Amino acid sequence: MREVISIHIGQAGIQVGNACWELYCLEHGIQPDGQMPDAFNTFFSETGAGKHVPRCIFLDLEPTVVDEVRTGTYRQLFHPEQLISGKEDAANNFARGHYTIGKEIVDLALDRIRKLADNCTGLQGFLVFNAVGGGTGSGLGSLLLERLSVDYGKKSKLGFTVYPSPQVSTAVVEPYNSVLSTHSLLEHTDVAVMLDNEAIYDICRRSLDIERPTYTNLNRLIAQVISSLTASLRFDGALNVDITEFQTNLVPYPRIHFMLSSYAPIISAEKAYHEQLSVAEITNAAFEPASMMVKCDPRHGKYMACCLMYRGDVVPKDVNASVATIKTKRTIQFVDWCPTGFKCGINYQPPTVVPGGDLAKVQRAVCMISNSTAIGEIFSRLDHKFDLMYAKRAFVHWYVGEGMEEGEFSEAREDLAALEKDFEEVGAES
Amino acid sequence: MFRQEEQPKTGVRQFGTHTTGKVDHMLGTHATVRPEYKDPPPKRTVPTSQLEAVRNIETQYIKARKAAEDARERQGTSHLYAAGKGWG
Amino acid sequence: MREIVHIQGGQCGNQIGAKFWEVVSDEHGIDPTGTYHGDSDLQLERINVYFNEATGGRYVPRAILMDLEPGTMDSVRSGPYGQIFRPDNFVFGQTGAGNNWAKGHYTEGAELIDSVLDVVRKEAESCDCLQGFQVCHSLGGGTGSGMGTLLISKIREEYPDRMMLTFSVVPSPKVSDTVVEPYNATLSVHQLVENADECMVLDNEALYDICFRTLKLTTPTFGDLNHLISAVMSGITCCLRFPGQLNADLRKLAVNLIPFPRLHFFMVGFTPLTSRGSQQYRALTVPELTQQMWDAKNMMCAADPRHGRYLTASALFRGRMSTKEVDEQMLNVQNKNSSYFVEWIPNNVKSSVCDIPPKGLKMSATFIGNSTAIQEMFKRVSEQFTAMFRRKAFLHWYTGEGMDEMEFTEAESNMNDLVSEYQQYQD
Ligand SMILES: Nc1nc2c(ncn2[C@@H]2O[C@H](COP(=O)(O)OP(=O)(O)OP(=O)(O)O)[C@@H](O)[C@H]2O)c(=O)[nH]1
Ligand SMILES: Nc1nc2c(ncn2[C@@H]2O[C@H](COP(=O)(O)OP(=O)(O)O)[C@@H](O)[C@H]2O)c(=O)[nH]1
Ligand SMILES: [Mg+2]
């Protein structure tokens, strides 16, 4: 049976999954106490009689966010030992999450993976959630993805990461934590979907027209894409696409596996009645540069391969009629050697709108996850953010003393510069 | 004869025949489009009767639309050939 | 005493074939319970061609359902007319092909071929004299394209003297569904040129403009496309299931329409297609059927038949009609435009008449066209294939499953050899 195990690492991973599991209980009618008053097997395992538990692990070195979930409204939903706390955090240090304190807790992390993978009949993929700007998300994530690669070969891993924005970022050592995190996630993660905070800030500012929103509104809006990406394993549609179909229709090369994401109808409650939504209209809105989830302008590069995944009442000619006008448009430009560049997927539920959420009820939806050569800009900016700080060796003695040697920064710098050459080489016209 | 056990219903959340993605306008008719799926009429010209029946009084909008239809009918009339009868 | 085993591969074959058995079993009068309630005595004359008689008057389709995912099997079973198949014939995998030709043909297909070949031989040995095999699948996928062509290669070894129909959809020029369409299609045609006895070629976007321009249907879906596919499926084997003035089995169509052993790629269409606003304005008579039959826009293949000459054509007429006026429409269509027909084959069009029309239709006909303009469809897939293979994009999922780059250079050569031999017969 189709089923997928989610892994939530770091402060962002717990809060994204807090909004992600809030949605998944709603779309299957699962009450917060864990009792439902066929399709739930991909995220909920049927335990005993009238009880479902999520297929997740909540690991975070800082104990202040796990117990918030433990004392929260979803106390009865989660298995108590399924959520892993810790004594002290990595505290924005990659070396602590990888060498000093990460090695102690990672043994408990893989042990719950045994029980979750043995309980699941046919595992189909892994959903790893982290923010590389922190110590626990990047450090423990690189350690966790190292052990999951040696223990589970050829199994797909979906990585939803939060890179720092060029303007809007929180921690000073985020360029240090991001560059070292790339040395693992290229050669371990199979499919990575990049997210950025300020791009979601811009989506919330204009499309939702809400003036002063917070992280709770981002995580609610991130979980829409997470739900829409795996909506095929849950609910039937004309063109079902599995987690191994994004894993092959989007990546042309093994080391190019970073993708953008977008969500077409982003309309508030007051704007829904005035706005007419059509399949041609939202597909044009899905390809707008302002609706991207990472601040890289797609006009600078070329789209490698796009995967439009639809929801709701979308007829199969209207995805074909929409993409006919998309290919004729001159602003959108593909690489020359990829004539067929689209993957289409049509499910049948409309997206389940959460109570108290700013997003309105929409009959149709599009989730476009696309590989593009403009992703080199979000890597080159952090490349520029890091060598400028590593030039006179600032914030290095914290990393040096915690087990990490000096040379790992040089290896991570060289590895990231190899990715810069790869995106430029693959976009060359011949 | 042996133990009768019903297999558990495990499957993807199926949907009814009423959805737009699975509606079949040629169902059991061998490649002919079914009734109640008639062709779209051109321009969808609603008559004034459907508007008068929903308004309470013949307002100025209804009166003007009836005047437009009367002008159309007066343009159609020929004064030499009656409808179904010959010259004069 | 002639029978056909149906094999459905992947999401395309299961969805088309589920609609195919909704049309055929309704045509023979089989209700979704499985028994018989038709009012015609002639439907039970030839019922063993597509059915196996069971206990209690129940008739089971001679159909083998094979894929690599459990998703489509639940969709077929839960749908109407889905309770008629044997649960034993529901052979299915668990991992899934993932739209990859390498996964379906080498690594996750091989452990299911021995499972599906077990029920292929069970269906064949249960019946009397195998007229042939009919398989419906896609070419851009990996569940039905890679795995289905592996089944055709095994069946051709086991049963080499029996016929083989393949009904396959192809990647479209105008739009697309998957990114790895030309990688899967070129490998599949490479496996279909030697193994398939005759291949009928379909295109989902030559179905859409038929649904939109001709049928005047505002909202066509896959359910509407598969019903137009399934109508042609019943037209090919019309003379087997019902008596006619000039019968024509599946082999009679093969010897007429295949001049050379590699040119077996055909195109098909269904003649009496009208909107419901044009039912009463239509005077259904054989000259009106032939003008729609020979029209280019009624073809269900995206290649335009005016751009190439017709090597051989055939029509499967159904209903009460006069043979010479069928014949004089065939002599007329070769004389009004003789530049569109091959000079060195006299009397290109083969005619056949079935005395029983389909349900609700007084006269119907099914066209099979072996036009040399089919090379435009294969050259545009080859145009997409040479672009992608030059940069070696999307190749590491194919070379990681045990298929090195040598097969891709071989598959492109046979595709280029297929379009060159069609091109020289246009001259
Ligand atoms: N989009 C989004 N990002 C978040 C959210 N919460 C935290 N982040 C990201 O987290 C980064 C801050 O560092 P964290 O990842 O939280 O640090 P950590 O994972 O707890 O690692 P340690 O502090 O060492 O335990 C910021 O740059 C944010 O981008 C959230 O709710 N939504
Ligand atoms: N006629 C028809 N074609 C379909 C249907 N579903 C998918 N297709 C075609 O199949 C192609 C994609 O094949 P895919 O779904 O990956 O087949 P699979 O790999 O065997 O599961 C597309 O070009 C579609 O046009 C259907 O219900 N009817
Ligand atoms: Mg922390």
Side-chain angles (χ1 to χ4, degrees):
Chain A
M1 277 79 78
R2 75 282 189 191
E3 53 195 355
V4 64
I5 301 182
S6 53
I7 295 98
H8 289 108
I9 317 166
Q11 176 66 32
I14 305 301
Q15 282 181 172
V16 160
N18 202 8
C20 180
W21 287 111
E22 186 261 330
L23 188 153
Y24 289 0
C25 296
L26 192 68
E27 63 186 0
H28 305 289
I30 313 292
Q31 282 159 309
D33 59 349
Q35 180 175 1
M36 183 176 176
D38 296 336
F40 61 95
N41 210 3
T42 187
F43 286 114
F44 294 143
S45 70
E46 203 272 330
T47 301
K51 188 72 174 177
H52 318 266
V53 289
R55 298 182 191 271
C56 70
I57 48 164
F58 282 10
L59 72 165
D60 185 64
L61 300 163
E62 215 176 359
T64 177
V65 73
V66 164
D67 60 350
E68 196 265 330
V69 188
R70 287 217 213 81
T71 59
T73 62
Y74 299 137
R75 174 197 305 105
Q76 306 264 59
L77 181 73
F78 295 86
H79 177 78
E81 193 268 330
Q82 192 178 6
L83 320 182
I84 296 94
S85 62
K87 259 70 181 176
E88 58 188 1
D89 58 346
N92 279 334
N93 200 317
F94 196 87
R96 269 169 78 96
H98 203 112
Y99 298 96
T100 296
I101 200 66
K103 307 197 314 155
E104 311 294 323
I105 199 66
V106 72
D107 200 3
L108 187 50
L110 277 296
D111 284 332
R112 293 294 99 194
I113 289 295
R114 311 304 106 191
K115 318 286 202 292
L116 266 296
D118 204 4
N119 209 325
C120 79
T121 81
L123 188 153
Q124 211 178 5
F126 290 88
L127 306 195
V128 60
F129 287 81
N130 46 2
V132 308
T136 301
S138 64
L140 194 51
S142 296
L143 201 55
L144 198 52
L145 287 164
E146 184 178 1
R147 313 278 287 264
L148 274 187
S149 302
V150 66
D151 211 357
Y152 295 80
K154 79 189 174 294
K155 277 294 188 262
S156 57
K157 329 199 201 199
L158 301 197
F160 304 108
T161 68
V162 185
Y163 283 176
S165 177
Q167 298 295 321
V168 172
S169 54
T170 75
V172 189
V173 292
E174 284 188 356
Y176 269 59
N177 286 338
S178 67
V179 164
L180 303 165
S181 72
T182 57
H183 188 270
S184 86
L185 56 92
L186 281 71
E187 50 184 359
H188 292 59
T189 72
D190 289 331
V191 170
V193 174
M194 327 321 288
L195 310 167
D196 201 357
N197 277 321
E198 174 58 31
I200 309 293
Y201 289 4
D202 200 3
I203 290 189
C204 288
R205 180 58 157 281
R206 312 213 327 279
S207 302
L208 286 78
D209 65 20
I210 184 66
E211 184 63 41
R212 203 166 288 101
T214 177
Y215 284 166
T216 309
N217 292 163
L218 280 74
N219 299 321
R220 198 164 309 188
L221 193 139
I222 290 300
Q224 284 308 322
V225 174
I226 313 302
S227 159
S228 189
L229 179 55
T230 180
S232 166
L233 319 171
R234 316 207 299 281
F235 322 113
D236 198 296
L239 293 169
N240 294 355
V241 291
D242 293 338
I243 201 171
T244 183
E245 315 207 342
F246 318 106
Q247 185 254 345
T248 185
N249 292 307
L250 275 78
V251 289
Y253 293 96
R255 281 190 53 254
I256 294 92
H257 56 83
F258 317 96
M259 273 72 78
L260 295 97
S261 52
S262 76
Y263 203 75
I266 304 287
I267 301 297
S268 70
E270 61 86 20
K271 209 178 302 311
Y273 305 121
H274 293 105
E275 184 72 28
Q276 161 188 16
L277 312 171
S278 178
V279 184
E281 187 163 357
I282 63 188
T283 314
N284 270 351
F287 274 103
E288 290 290 327
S291 291
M292 282 319 108
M293 286 210 161
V294 61
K295 286 212 306 181
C296 54
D297 193 68
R299 302 178 264 249
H300 306 330
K302 306 173 163 333
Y303 286 162
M304 166 56 229
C306 317
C307 180
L308 296 160
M309 193 162 179
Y310 281 60
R311 288 180 86 153
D313 282 329
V314 172
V315 299
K317 80 184 181 223
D318 271 11
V319 63
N320 273 3
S322 300
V323 73
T325 69
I326 288 294
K327 281 186 180 292
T328 58
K329 188 70 172 67
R330 293 305 98 174
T331 302
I332 170 169
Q333 187 65 255
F334 291 166
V335 69
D336 43 352
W337 36 255
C338 183
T340 174
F342 281 88
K343 181 75 182 72
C344 300
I346 310 173
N347 297 297
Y348 295 150
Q349 293 180 356
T352 56
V353 287
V354 287
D358 292 330
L359 282 170
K361 181 176 173 66
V362 295
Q363 301 282 348
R364 279 84 75 95
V366 179
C367 166
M368 176 259 284
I369 290 181
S370 71
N371 202 321
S372 181
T373 54
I375 304 169
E377 287 182 351
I378 77 168
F379 279 104
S380 73
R381 273 185 268 91
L382 275 297
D383 185 277
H384 182 77
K385 283 266 274 164
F386 165 72
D387 47 36
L388 187 148
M389 190 156 38
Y390 196 35
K392 48 189 66 175
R393 211 156 310 276
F395 305 108
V396 185
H397 77 91
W398 287 104
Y399 285 77
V400 160
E402 302 279 345
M404 192 172 291
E405 70 269 15
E406 184 79 28
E408 192 164 356
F409 294 94
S410 72
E411 300 216 25
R413 170 72 196 190
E414 181 69 30
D415 204 24
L416 202 50
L419 187 64
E420 287 293 318
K421 189 174 72 175
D422 285 324
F423 285 162
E424 188 176 1
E425 185 175 1
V426 70
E429 184 178 358
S430 66
Chain B
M1 201 267 292
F2 276 119
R3 200 143 62 78
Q4 173 172 1
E5 192 205 10
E6 303 96 12
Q7 280 195 10
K9 313 173 184 177
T10 52
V12 183
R13 178 193 285 233
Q14 293 303 279
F15 286 101
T17 70
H18 284 94
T19 177
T20 71
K22 292 187 173 183
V23 55
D24 196 2
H25 312 134
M26 295 181 286
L27 188 153
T29 54
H30 204 290
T32 47
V33 60
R34 272 178 71 237
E36 298 175 353
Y37 300 97
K38 65 178 73 66
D39 284 319
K43 282 188 171 198
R44 301 172 303 172
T45 48
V46 62
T48 65
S49 177
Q50 196 169 0
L51 275 78
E52 182 179 357
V54 76
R55 268 79 175 258
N56 293 318
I57 301 171
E58 275 199 357
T59 67
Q60 271 190 349
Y61 176 49
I62 291 170
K63 189 174 182 292
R65 203 142 174 173
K66 290 190 315 151
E69 283 188 352
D70 285 331
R72 177 73 271 174
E73 287 172 13
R74 286 219 293 280
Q75 188 65 253
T77 46
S78 70
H79 287 172
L80 301 176
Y81 207 76
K85 207 252 179 184
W87 300 73
Chain C
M1 293 184 287
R2 289 90 59 85
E3 68 275 15
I4 296 295
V5 179
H6 191 198
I7 308 158
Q8 325 189 0
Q11 194 211 13
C12 195
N14 288 260
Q15 280 275 354
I16 284 182
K19 199 53 70 164
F20 159 76
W21 288 108
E22 284 190 359
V23 162
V24 164
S25 57
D26 187 26
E27 185 184 53
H28 286 315
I30 302 301
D31 50 17
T33 61
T35 179
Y36 173 67
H37 286 88
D39 295 331
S40 302
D41 204 4
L42 211 59
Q43 303 170 347
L44 270 295
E45 183 187 4
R46 307 306 208 104
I47 204 56
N48 63 6
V49 54
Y50 280 162
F51 288 95
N52 278 312
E53 176 163 28
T55 64
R58 187 177 180 88
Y59 283 170
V60 64
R62 200 179 318 265
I64 303 178
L65 288 178
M66 54 96 81
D67 61 358
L68 285 180
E69 300 175 0
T72 64
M73 295 296 172
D74 290 331
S75 173
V76 167
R77 187 168 336 118
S78 66
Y81 285 47
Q83 283 271 350
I84 50 179
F85 305 96
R86 287 217 268 261
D88 203 3
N89 292 8
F90 277 55
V91 54
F92 61 95
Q94 275 295 281
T95 63
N99 297 349
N100 196 1
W101 195 93
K103 300 291 189 68
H105 201 269
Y106 284 75
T107 181
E108 281 98 11
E111 79 265 16
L112 273 297
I113 300 299
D114 50 352
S115 180
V116 69
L117 273 175
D118 193 28
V119 70
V120 164
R121 221 161 303 123
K122 281 175 70 175
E123 292 293 329
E125 288 157 355
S126 60
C127 50
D128 182 76
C129 166
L130 277 299
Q131 178 61 41
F133 290 98
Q134 155 189 338
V135 55
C136 61
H137 56 95
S138 50
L139 304 189
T143 310
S145 172
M147 183 177 177
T149 42
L150 188 52
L151 192 53
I152 298 310
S153 70
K154 296 288 184 32
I155 290 182
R156 276 304 286 183
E157 293 294 326
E158 287 179 353
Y159 298 147
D161 292 331
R162 318 262 67 83
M163 281 306 296
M164 183 92 67
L165 278 176
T166 81
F167 288 93
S168 58
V169 303
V170 299
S172 178
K174 308 175 182 178
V175 290
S176 161
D177 213 355
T178 79
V179 189
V180 287
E181 281 168 27
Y183 280 119
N184 304 322
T186 53
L187 293 170
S188 185
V189 180
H190 172 77
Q191 275 277 356
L192 277 188
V193 287
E194 293 83 4
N195 290 319
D197 216 319
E198 50 187 17
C199 172
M200 312 282 176
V201 168
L202 300 174
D203 186 277
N204 290 115
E205 276 67 16
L207 268 292
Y208 271 136
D209 51 356
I210 283 175
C211 280
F212 186 76
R213 178 174 291 109
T214 79
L215 271 166
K216 295 210 164 324
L217 202 53
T218 56
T219 317
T221 182
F222 287 166
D224 274 331
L225 298 191
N226 296 354
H227 199 94
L228 279 182
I229 297 306
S230 69
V232 172
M233 310 276 270
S234 183
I236 312 299
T237 72
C238 77
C239 286
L240 295 167
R241 300 176 279 102
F242 293 124
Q245 290 165 351
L246 188 153
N247 294 294
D249 67 327
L250 196 154
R251 192 97 57 103
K252 268 175 74 76
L253 276 300
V255 56
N256 292 303
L257 280 149
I258 303 167
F260 300 95
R262 306 256 306 279
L263 309 176
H264 49 69
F265 292 91
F266 302 149
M267 58 180 62
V268 298
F270 195 57
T271 66
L273 299 175
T274 59
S275 68
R276 199 156 263 283
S278 187
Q279 295 297 109
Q280 66 260 16
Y281 303 100
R282 184 51 78 81
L284 75 166
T285 300
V286 176
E288 192 69 31
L289 268 69
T290 61
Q291 304 282 264
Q292 203 171 353
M293 185 165 65
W294 292 99
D295 187 73
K297 285 317 284 160
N298 203 8
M299 308 307 256
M300 289 203 313
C301 175
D304 193 0
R306 266 91 60 87
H307 303 166
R309 294 181 179 177
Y310 271 119
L311 269 171
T312 317
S314 292
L316 272 291
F317 276 96
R318 312 189 62 202
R320 197 67 41 78
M321 61 193 52
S322 71
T323 61
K324 83 155 287 293
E325 194 272 327
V326 172
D327 283 331
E328 76 180 2
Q329 286 307 131
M330 297 312 185
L331 181 67
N332 275 347
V333 71
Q334 288 182 176
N335 282 350
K336 298 287 98 176
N337 52 3
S338 58
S339 68
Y340 292 154
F341 281 96
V342 173
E343 300 294 324
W344 48 268
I345 291 176
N347 301 311
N348 288 268
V349 189
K350 205 266 177 185
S351 57
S352 85
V353 172
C354 180
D355 288 331
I356 296 299
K359 200 159 175 296
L361 278 78
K362 186 182 293 293
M363 286 180 284
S364 88
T366 305
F367 187 79
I368 312 172
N370 187 16
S371 67
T372 198
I374 195 66
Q375 59 98 28
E376 300 137 20
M377 170 160 278
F378 291 138
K379 77 154 74 73
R380 69 186 63 248
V381 185
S382 176
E383 186 177 1
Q384 290 183 356
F385 182 77
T386 59
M388 262 195 198
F389 186 64
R390 185 160 34 78
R391 204 60 77 93
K392 274 153 81 44
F394 295 101
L395 201 66
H396 76 288
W397 302 126
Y398 285 79
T399 196
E401 304 319 294
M403 176 182 38
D404 47 349
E405 80 202 326
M406 282 327 284
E407 281 90 6
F408 288 84
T409 62
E410 288 180 353
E412 191 197 304
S413 72
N414 296 115
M415 287 272 316
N416 204 3
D417 188 74
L418 183 60
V419 301
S420 51
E421 62 177 356
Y422 271 113
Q423 211 278 339
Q424 52 93 18
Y425 282 147
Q426 196 267 337
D427 302 343

